[PDB]
C-alpha cells in the first residue's frame, strides 16, 4: 500500500570522522561507501541520498597488504593522441594522498548524478586537523 | 479593449518578420514606434505600418489615448507560399517558394 | 482505362520506383485492380423448396392471425376513397389483398394506396406474404392457392 520512501527535505543527515591510520584501503573504502550511500539506515531509498557526511583524516597513512605499495598502479588517459599516464601507489601518495581514498570510494559508489552527489558527502584529508569542527562530527570506527 | 490590426499576405516569410516582432513585445506604443524607425530591416517597415495602423485603429474606433497603450500580442503566422520554377544546371528544375506572412498586432492597455 | 502503354521513365538509372504504365492500379487516376463487370446475382431455388417455403410461411399466418380469409371482396366503382373507407370497418391498414378474379376496379383503386397491394392469387410471393402486416385472401383465391401449392 504505497511503501515508505525517504523524502529529501525530511532526511536528517549526520556527520562522522574516521581516522584511516593503519587501515586497509579497500575495507575502509567499502565501509565508507556503504555509509555514504545510506545503506546502514533503516530508511534506505535507492533514489534519494540518505547517507551521512564523513571526514576521512590521515589519508596518507592508509595501509595496503602484499607488494601493492609499489605494484598497484593507477592508470588514466589524458584524452590525448597517445597520452596514457600511470602512477604507482607510492607515487600517488607522494603527490596526491587524497586521490587514493577518493578513487577507492568512487569505484565502489554507483555511477550517475546521485552517485556523484553521494561522493560530495565524503571529505578526505592528508593532515590530522580538519576545519569542519562546526558540525560536531562524531567519531566512527 | 484590445483593438487588432493585421497585414495578411505580407510579402516576406514568417522567420524574417518574426525576428523584428520579438523586439516589440509588451512595450509601450511610443517606445515601440521608435525602434522600428531605427531597426535596419524591411520587415521593420512592414511591421511598423501594422502597429501604426493598430494605434489609429484603436484610437478612432474604440479606446482612445496614445500614452497608455502596449503591444500585448504581436505574432507572425506563415501564409500561402507561391510556387515558382527555378531552372538549374543539367536540365533539372527546382520549385522555389515565394513565402508570405500574416502579421497581427494587438494594442491593449 | 484511357492512356498509353508507354513507360513514363525507364527501368533503372533514375532514383525512382520502377513503373510500367500510367494505368497501374497503384497509381492515381487509373486502374481499379479487380474491376466489376455487369453480373447476374439471381440464384436457383428448387421448385419443392419454393413451394415448401410458401407452405411454411402461409401456414404461419394462420397461427399469428395475419391471414384474414374472406368471401367476395370488391370495390363498387374504380375509386380509392371507397376502398380506403371500407378498410376502416375491416380494421386494416398495411395489407396484401389477394384475389382470384382480379378486378380492374379494385386494382386501379389500390395503386395510389401505399400500404395496400393487390396481387393475383396466382402471383403470390415469398417476400410479399411476410412483408405486409395482414393478408386478405378471397375464398376463390384460397381455393386457387391451395391447388397451386398442393
Amino acid at each position: 500500500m504505497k511503501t515508505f520512501t525517504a523524502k529529501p527535505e525530511t532526511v536528517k543527515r549526520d556527520w562522522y570522522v574516521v581516522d584511516a591510520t593503519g587501515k586497509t584501503l579497500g575495507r575502509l573504502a567499502t565501509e565508507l561507501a556503504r555509509r555514504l550511500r545510506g545503506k546502514h539506515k533503516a530508511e534506505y531509498t535507492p533514489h534519494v541520498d540518505t547517507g551521512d557526511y564523513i571526514i576521512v583524516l590521515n589519508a596518507d597513512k592508509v595501509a595496503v597488504t602484499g607488494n601493492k605499495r609499489t605494484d598497484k598502479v593507477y592508470y588514466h588517459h589524458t584524452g590525448h593522441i597517445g597520452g596514457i599516464k600511470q602512477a604507482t601507489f607510492e607515487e600517488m601518495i607522494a603527490r596526491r594522498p587524497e586521490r587514493v581514498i577518493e578513487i577507492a570510494v568512487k569505484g565502489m559508489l554507483p555511477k550517475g548524478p546521485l552517485g556523484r552527489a553521494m561522493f560530495r558527502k565524503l571529505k578526505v584529508y592528508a593532515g590530522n586537523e580538519h576545519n569542519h569542527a562546526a558540525q560536531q562530527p562524531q567519531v566512527l570506527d | 479593449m484590445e483593438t487588432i490590426a493585421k497585414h495578411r499576405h505580407a510579402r516576406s516569410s514568417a522567420q524574417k518578420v518574426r525576428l523584428v516582432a520579438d523586439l516589440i513585445r509588451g512595450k509601450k506604443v511610443s517606445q515601440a514606434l521608435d525602434i522600428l524607425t531605427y531597426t535596419n530591416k524591411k520587415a521593420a517597415v512592414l511591421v511598423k505600418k501594422v502597429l501604426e495602423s493598430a494605434i489609429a485603429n484603436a484610437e478612432h474606433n474604440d479606446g482612445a489615448d496614445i500614452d497608455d497603450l502596449k503591444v500585448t500580442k504581436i505574432f507572425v503566422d506563415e501564409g500561402p507560399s507561391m510556387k515558382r520554377i527555378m531552372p538549374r544546371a543539367k536540365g533539372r528544375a527546382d520549385r522555389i517558394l515565394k513565402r508570405t506572412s500574416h502579421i497581427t498586432v494587438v494594442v491593449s492597455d | 482505362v484511357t492512356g498509353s502503354g508507354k513507360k513514363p521513365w525507364r527501368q533503372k538509372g533514375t532514383g525512382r520506383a520502377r513503373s510500367g504504365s500510367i494505368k497501374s492500379p497503384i497509381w492515381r487516376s487509373g486502374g481499379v485492380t479487380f474491376a466489376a463487370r455487369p453480373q447476374d446475382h439471381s440464384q436457383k431455388v428448387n421448385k419443392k423448396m419454393y413451394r415448401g417455403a410458401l407452405k411454411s410461411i402461409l401456414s404461419e399466418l394462420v397461427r399469428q392471425d395475419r391471414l384474414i380469409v374472406v368471401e367476395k371482396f370488391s370495390v363498387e366503382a374504380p375509386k380509392t376513397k371507397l376502398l380506403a373507407q371500407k378498410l376502416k370497418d375491416m380494421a386494416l391498414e398495411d395489407v396484401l389483398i389477394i384475389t382470384g378474379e382480379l378486378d380492374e376496379n379494385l386494382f386501379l383503386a389500390a395503386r395510389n394506396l401505399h400500404k395496400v397491394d393487390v396481387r393475383d392469387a396466382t402471383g403470390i410471393d415469398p417476400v410479399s406474404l411476410i412483408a405486409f402486416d395482414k393478408v386478405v385472401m378471397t375464398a376463390d383465391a384460397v381455393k386457387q392457392v391451395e391447388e397451386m401449392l398442393a
Binding site: - | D22, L23, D34, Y38, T39 | -
Partner: protein, 55 residues
C-alpha cells in the same frame, strides 16, 4: 555534404537562439529642437548638436 537523418525543431531552435537581433535603446535628443535620432547621426529635419548645418 548531406545530413544522415533530419534535425529537429529543438536543434533548429537551439541554433536560432543567437539569431535574435538587439534594439537600439539609445536614442539621442537634439538640443534646440528636441528631436530623436541615432547617436553621432543627423536628424530627419537636418540638425546635429543644436545647430543647422544642412539645407
Amino acid at each position: 555534404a548531406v545530413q544522415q537523418n533530419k534535425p529537429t525543431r529543438s536543434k533548429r531552435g537551439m541554433r536560432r537562439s543567437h539569431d535574435a537581433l538587439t534594439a537600439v535603446t539609445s536614442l539621442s535628443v537634439d538640443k534646440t529642437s528636441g528631436e530623436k535620432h541615432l547617436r553621432h547621426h543627423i536628424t530627419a529635419d537636418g540638425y546635429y548638436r543644436g545647430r543647422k548645418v544642412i539645407a
